[PDB]
Each structure stands twice: as structure tokens, then as C-alpha cells.
Design goal:
This is part of a larger assembly, with 1 copy of chain A (92 residues), 2 copies of chain B, 1 copy of chain D (108 residues) and 2 copies of chain E. Chain B is 60% helix and 5% strand. Chain B contains 3 helices and 2 strands. Chain D has 108 residues and is mainly alpha-helical. Chain D has one domain: Orthogonal Bundle (Histone, subunit A). Chain E has helices at 7-10, 23-34, 45-72, 80-89; strands at residues 42-43, 77-78. Classes of the chains: A mainly alpha (92), B mainly alpha (78), D mainly alpha (108), E mainly alpha (94). At the A-D interface, helix 1, strand 1, helix 2, strand 2 and helix 3 of A face helix 1, helix 2, strand 1, helix 3 and strand 2 of D. Chain D: Belongs to the histone H2A family. Chain D: It is found in: Nucleus; Chromosome. Chain D: There is a cross-link at residues 3, 5 (Glycyl lysine isopeptide (Lys-Gly) (interchain with G-Cter in ubiquitin)). Chain D: It comes from Homo sapiens.
Amino acid sequence: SRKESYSIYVYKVLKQVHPDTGISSKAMGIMNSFVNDIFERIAGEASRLAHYNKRSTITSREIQTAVRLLLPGELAKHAVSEGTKAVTKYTS
Amino acid sequence: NIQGITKPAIRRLARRGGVKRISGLIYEETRGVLKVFLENVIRDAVTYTEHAKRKTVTAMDVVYALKRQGRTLYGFGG
Amino acid sequence: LRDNIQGITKPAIRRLARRGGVKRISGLIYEETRGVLKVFLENVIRDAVTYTEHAKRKTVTAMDVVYALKRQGRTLYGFGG
Amino acid sequence: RAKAKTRSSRAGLQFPVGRVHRLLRKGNYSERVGAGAPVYLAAVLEYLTAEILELAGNAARDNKKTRIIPRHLQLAIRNDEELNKLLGRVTIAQGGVLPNIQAVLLPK
Amino acid sequence: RPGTVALREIRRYQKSTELLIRKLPFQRLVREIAQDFKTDLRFQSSAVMALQEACEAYLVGLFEDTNLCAIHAKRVTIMPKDIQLARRIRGERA
Amino acid sequence: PGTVALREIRRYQKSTELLIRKLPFQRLVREIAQDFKTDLRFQSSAVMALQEACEAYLVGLFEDTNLCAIHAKRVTIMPKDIQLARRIRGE
């Protein structure tokens, strides 16, 4: 039975940057660990933000704020820009 | 204007920390440590304030910043 | 017998020291390091067993130790969880 | 009803938005999930993962290799202060340490 | 008169729950640093004074580690390179 | 000479495998588990996750001890440099 992980999806995303490149099974496990650690950070931070606001809803603005506490550098505003693009293009 | 936190105040903090002998290049480098710490708790707090949409920077937004840094405080809001 | 933690051998501790970038190593350092090495398991195995004792299993999983390492602020990749 | 396709494709996204929409509710983080939140989180995870995957491929390229190993992933972290901060509480299995010397160790 | 009992400072600035930086200069310090991320700010008195308590406690916590660094490094005198050791080994100067 | 140890540094920093012998480490892990509680038994992956966390932790301790000795104007480590590296971390 399936075990909830991103192995094929990170190797799909690799073609964005290095189509020439292979991934060792060990390295696949490291990147599978990375994407779920960032999920545990953001989902906890956004839920604690939502708790401080007592709201029933998570939203684009809970995560937009949580990403700003994940990272100090402008990769935060670029990821926030990518989230606002994607939500816009999904709802249009 | 950082010079409003005084030469004896930076000495007093080290003396409250129990220090004996010192050398004076500690003072401005300690203002450097304090500047980055103070900026971090401020920028964290304003980041929590702007999620609540108010222009008024507010005690519990500073508490959420300090609590994210693992620090608990009372009397102001707590 | 060699159970006195001396089974963590001098040249193995010295190789960890060399990866750590340190130069001259005084002959008491190996034993001081074995003291730290016990205490690290007295944190990590002990709390990992409190996660094994959540399910009350006989098998310690890589998850059980990763949860202990997560609460102790030293997270680990490659094993998942 | 129509022949299915991923919601990520309309969003412009590369990870599974559907199971992110599942996880955000099933993890008990809130009573309700806003229609943009899983799309936004997929976009954030993708953006940050693509940003580090370039550094992974570049770390292998620097060592003139073609197959990624945990060493190239450690090198990707130690090539960027944002990653050196973000992953400052992370252990990489078989990644080792960045090779470094304090000048005091050197002869003359 | 001169050159005796430096403990006159130790015996004064820790007898009660006092703070060592004066209030008016601290209140004009924080606001200039805050507005660079986002301007048009206003501040609660209970917000600004919650910063100073953390700041002075952190500064005292550094100096507590710092004097042992000098003693280990064969000095009675603390010097800037003690902070270069301490703040990096706590993982903060990185 | 007394200094070509600087070539060992570069070799063991190029290397990234685990350095303690698996059997000694597994024996120690089991002994510490068994005098703690009864019938605890470890999957190989748990012993490996333990050993990777241990050796990464000790590489961190040795880096921290290096900076303590460098700060003390030494080129040598003594147990006191480790005891500073603990107290300065709060360990």
C-alpha cells in the first residue's frame, strides 16, 4: 500500500533546471525529506497564525505571512509572488 | 540615533552580566549585536502586526514574535 | 571485554576529529568524547524509546528516533518522517 | 461530468495540489481551507524546491558529475546563506561537512 | 577616591527588577529601524517596552558566556573576539 | 615535520561515509537501550539514523572545539576546550 511521498514529482521538477542529470536513491530520499519538512514548518506556522486570529479558515494570507517567517531573504517574496500568480491563474 | 544608549549603559549590561576587565572596542560591537537582535524582534513583530492589518504595532504582535523565538513574557498583554 | 565505551576506538574518534578540522589532539580527548557520546544517547535513545512506547512496540523504527531528534532540535533527512 | 485532469495544470503548477488540499484539512490545521491555499502552498514548495534543485545540479556540475548524491545536496546548502539558515537545524545523511581550514593550521 | 572597588557597579544595577537603558532614547531608536520594512507605523507603549526587556536579558546572557571565554583564552579582559566565539558556537552569528 | 596531519583533514573532509565501526556502535546502542528498558530491539535503519546523528553531532563538537582552541591561541585541543564548547553552547 502507498506511503505518501514525492519521488516522481521531484524528478519531474528537475527538468526545469537540469534535464541532463540523474538522482541517486539516497538523494531522492533527501529531497523527499526536504519538501515535507517545509510543509511541517509552513502548515504549523499558518495554523498558529490562524489560531492567533481565531479564524476557522486558512487562506493565501496565512501562508503569505508564514513564508515570511520561514525565510528572511527575497526568496520569500518570490515564493509569495509565485503563490499569488498560481491562485490568480487557477481562479481566472 | 544609536548614541542614545549610553557608554555607561553598555558597561552596566556587562556588569549586570558580572564582567571584570573589558576593552572598549566591546561597546560599539555590542551595539552591533544589540542592533541585529533588536531589529530581528522588531521586524518579526511588524510582520505579525501587518497580518492583523492595523497600523498600530501592538504588544501581542511582539509577543508572537518573541514566542516564535522561544521567549515567553508577561504584564504587557500576558 | 571492551564494553567500557573504549570499543569506540581511538583512531575512529581521531577520524571524526580530523573531519571536524582539529589539529593536535591531547590523549584525554578520546575519553572526554566517549563521555559526550554516552550522554547524546541518554538524550536520543531515551526519547526515541518514549516514541516507541507511544505505540508500545518491540521494534524501534527510524521514525521513533527522528521524532526524538525533531523535539531535540537536530532534524534528519533521508529516512523520511 | 468530464475526463479528469490535474487542478495544478490550470494553476500553472508542478506538484499535486489535490493531496495538498487533502493534507491541509486532514492534518487538523483548521476547520476550513480557502480555495487558493493548497495552490499557494504547492507553488511555494515548488518555487523553493526548484531554487535548491538548480544548486544541486550546479553542485554536481562543479564536481563534473551527472548523478546527484547527498554530497551535492550538502554543497547546494553551503553555496547559499538562505539555505545555510533554513537548513541550519538539518542533518543530511552521507552529506559530510564543507572542507575548511583555519589559517593557523598551515605551515609558515 | 580613585582606582578602587569596581563592584560599586555590580552592587547598584542588579538590586531590583530595573532596566539599564533610559526610556525616551529607546523609544526613538526602535521606530527608525521598524519603518524600513513598512512605514506609516504607530506604536503601543506596551509594545515598545516589551522589546527592551528581551534585549537587555539577551545582552546579559551574552556577557555571562563571554567572561568565561576570556578566562579560557588566558585573559581577565573581555575583547570583541570573545563575542566572535560565543555567538557563532550558539549558531546565531551564521 | 609533525604537521602532515593537515593532509588527513582534507582526506576525511573529502570523505562523507560514517566513521565509527558498525558492530561496536550497534553493541553500544543495544547495551544503552537494554539497561534503560526491557526487550527494546532496533531496525538497522534506526541504528543508522542514530549513528548519523551522533557523528554529525561530534563533527559539530569538534568544529566548536577547534574555534575554542584557535580563540585560546592554541594549535592543540585539551578536555577544557570541550568543556568550554559545552558551557558556551549551554550543553
